[PDB]
Design a protein around this ligand. Structure first.
Ligand code: HEM
Ligand code: HEM
Ligand SMILES: Cc1cc(N)nc2cc(-c3ccc(CCN)cc3)ccc12
Ligand SMILES: Cc1cc(N)nc2cc(-c3ccc(CCN)cc3)ccc12
Ligand SMILES: C[C@H](O)[C@H](O)[C@H]1CNc2nc(N)[nH]c(=O)c2N1
Ligand SMILES: C[C@H](O)[C@H](O)[C@H]1CNc2nc(N)[nH]c(=O)c2N1
Ligand SMILES: [Zn+2]
Lengths: 415, 410
């Protein structure tokens, strides 16, 4: 690799210089001859002593460099203490300061996230003292209450104990803390959210009694210390929701749509200094298109384009009439209107992409770069009238990071 | 190794073997992806292997691999690279190579049409006047009174690089852009530089909003020369709206024929620096990018005004609403004047069908997701949810420097 890589914005002509890519840590999947950039994903295999040493040192060095104490006595002592501990226990524990730094930087490093202008403002909840699923339930409830804040949403992460031997993992089996159930019908239709059919079925087998409605908040399915997972009902008063209405179309409310206020993804893995936090639910606030375009208008999701287009009395026989495009806009108008009216934090795709460009420029200037995944950063509607469409980006993997992990029901050893 | 791509909407999985045949670079490395970079950065010796690979796949394509005709062609080519430091393609080869450069064009969503391409051999051309004649014939043919037909015209290949044939226009038909004294821009801002260069070369500009630019044509490395495309050859569409009667009062129009003229065609190591090619428009090319880019005609505000939308906050999505209406009008207007055009929904379905065809008969299809997904309503088109593998196959179309940056005037 060369020392300097340049990116260009084809709308503004601004050119930025990236040097941070030199700290790249893992493979992208791309090679010299193929690009895997549109590929979505390109047990007791735990880190050996030898594999762990340099990964720990790398992180510790980076941490002390960030607090302007690189090469200090405290730095050297921390290094030695981490080494001793890896040597005698085959693992090590992070200091609270290091945990907070690591969590914030995994967000900062998350190439697919358009919301990272916010990265340094993250409430970190240290849950490494947790031992049971009931305890996990307590921590998650507190997280949800704090992050929701009566609609004035605050970004937050709760971190449970790291992996040891791979047979004692903490996991949240939910993909997000709050999601709606989906039920496959005998006739092939789906009630509720089709995205969540598999996990809904799992909950039902585990003993969940389903209301069988369109917007049933799923139970938490929580695994502590590698034991079998356990079911819990989130208190309904902790689940903030927004009825979707349209500022012009009075009939829009009659669709009976609502969505939940807090996006809180719970199936990802947090890696810091070679340590693996398999349960680390984190939450921010929504970009409207996430609900209005994907959740509602994806064919294999709620798929309401048809019903909305009908109520708008559009010609639905020619694709070239753009009836889908027109309905898509009104739905996203309704979603933003309904959240803003109920004073629940939400950001539109124009504002968010504009902030991200400012953020990326600042990062290039003060950090020497900003990894970014164009395929994910550009919003799912109106792509080219947002500033990120014309922005060249470089994608690469920095650590600490958030990673994908297999679904736990595919790996769990039932006791 | 074999690679899988998955559609997340339909769960269809395809297997790519075709990528194993590429040897050009993508720009990425194992540690940095450059997927969204627009332009990631011969001799006797270099030429023959390249010529060999091309002939090999041509004779393999007509199922005569290793035939007497095949063997003799290789030898004929080798002798010719020896005695002339280059070689000339057979007509069949020229046609095969042009079609395959299109088939291999990872950024083009229109490739289901790839084998329907009229190839015009212009390799006997020697002067800018001759270039003009060939290009007029191309435009007349491709336009076909609204029933557009894909075509490419191929001018003489690069020799020593001092005698290049170049079309200086980025497209055969484009509108002038003029840098206004008060600061703003009249016409198309994408073309301001080229427009100035035409004026500087003697073109008398009407200084309207839709002035068709003259052709600026360079033959054998000589100074370029100006030509006016006969107006009756330039098909245009007045843009109106099926419900908003005021839309026509905006005075907008566009041309029916998209004909990119500034790329390079490479076939078996040979380089064709002048190779204008044309198809027909996808509506968003005009209605999203050409009209609504900030640095293009930038008409969202005017439209949104006439629609009486709340433009005080972004979250009204007034830009999004105006965007859809403009693209409705563009499609409606071409369709009403019976000029070939495809909407982004129909175009992307066809591309998904094309991908399936190509994976079946060819073992893959190189595709650039960043360019294939339309600039509006992305995820409600089927390509958004389609994993793609991008890789570079030859014959191909490549970018080249703008000629005014290199040309030593005379
Ligand atoms: C605070 C406001 C935030 C906004 C507006 C925001 C916005 C987004 C959006 C729109 C996406 C794409 C999601 C999708 O299409 O499904 C995304 C992805 C992502 N975000 Fe953020 N986000 C925010 C907060 C956070 C926080 C607090 C974290 C972690 C601490 C985070 C980490 C991530 C990660 C790892 C992804 C990629 C998910 C994946 O690949 O599956 N974001 N974000
Ligand atoms: C027949 C109808 C066709 C349609 C509907 C179509 C559609 C498109 C569209 C929408 C783009 C994106 C252009 C942009 O965003 O600037 C594109 C790019 C491209 N097309 Fe096609 N196309 C067609 C025919 C052709 C033909 C005949 C050729 C060559 C023989 C071709 C070669 C290319 C190439 C090389 C690019 C990428 C150029 C670049 O990298 O800037 N296309 N096409
Ligand atoms: C922290 C945060 C905030 C936000 N507004 N959206 C997120 C969206 C995700 C996300 C949601 C769903 C998926 C599944 C594929 N779309 C992948 C990632 C994760 C975290 C988010
Ligand atoms: C052959 C063909 C057909 C079509 N409908 N659009 C094209 C559009 C292009 C094209 C147009 C503009 C640009 C510059 C960046 N938008 C790059 C490529 C090239 C060829 C096209
Ligand atoms: C195939 C493609 O990679 C996949 O559909 C991606 C594309 N970009 C995306 N971008 C975001 N923000 N979210 C997504 O789910 C996706 N899906
Ligand atoms: C930065 C980015 O690569 C650039 O804006 C690209 C993005 N995708 C595109 N896709 C198409 N079809 N046409 C374009 O001009 C572009 N521009
Ligand atoms: Zn890549």
């Amino acid at each position: 690799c060369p020392r300097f890589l340049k990116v260009k914005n084809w709308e503004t002509e601004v050119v930025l210089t990236d040097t941070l890519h030199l700290k790249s840590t893992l493979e992208t999947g791309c090679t010299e001859y193929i690009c895997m950039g549109s590929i979505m994903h390109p047990p007791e295999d735990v880190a050996t002593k030898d594999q762990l040493f340099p990964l720990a040192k790398e992180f510790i060095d980076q941490y002390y460099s960030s607090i302007k104490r690189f090469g200090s006595k405290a730095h050297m002592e921390r290094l030695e203490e981490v080494n001793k501990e890896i040597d005698t226990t085959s693992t090590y524990q992070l200091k609270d300061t290091e945990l907070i730094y690591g969590a914030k930087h995994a967000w900062r490093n998350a190439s697919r996230c358009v919301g990272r202008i916010q990265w340094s403002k993250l409430q970190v909840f240290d849950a490494r003292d947790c031992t049971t699923a009931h305890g996990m339930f307590n921590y998650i409830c507190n997280h949800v209450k704090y992050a929701t804040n009566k609609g004035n949403l605050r970004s937050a992460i709760t971190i449970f104990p790291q992996r040891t031997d791979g047979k004692h993992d903490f996991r949240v089996w939910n993909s997000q803390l709050i999601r709606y159930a989906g039920y496959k019908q005998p006739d092939g239709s789906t009630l509720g959210d089709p995205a969540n059919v598999q996990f809904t079925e799992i909950c039902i087998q585990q003993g969940w009694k389903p209301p069988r409605g369109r917007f049933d908040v799923l139970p938490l399915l929580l695994q502590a210390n590698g034991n079998d997972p356990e079911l819990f009902q989130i208190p309904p008063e902790l689940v903030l929701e927004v009825p979707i209405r349209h500022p012009k179309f009075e009939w829009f409310k009659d669709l009976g749509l609502k969505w939940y206020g807090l996006p809180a993804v719970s199936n990802m893995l947090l890696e810091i200094g070679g340590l693996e936090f398999s349960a680390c639910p984190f939450s921010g606030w929504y970009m409207g298109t996430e609900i209005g375009v994907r959740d509602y208008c994806d064919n294999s999701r709620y798929n309401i384009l048809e019903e909305v287009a009908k109520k708008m009395n559009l010609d639905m026989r020619k694709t070239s009439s753009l009836w889908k495009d027109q309905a898509l806009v009104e739905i996203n108008i309704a979603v933003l209107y309904s959240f803003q009216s109920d004073k629940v934090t939400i950001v539109d795709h124009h504002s968010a992409t504009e902030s991200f460009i400012k953020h990326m420029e600042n990062e290039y200037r003060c950090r020497g770069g900003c990894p970014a995944d164009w395929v994910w950063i550009v919003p799912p509607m109106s792509g080219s009238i947002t500033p990120v469409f014309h922005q060249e980006m470089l994608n690469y993997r920095l650590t600490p990071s958030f990673e994908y992990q297999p679904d736990p029901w595919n790996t769990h050893v039932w006791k």
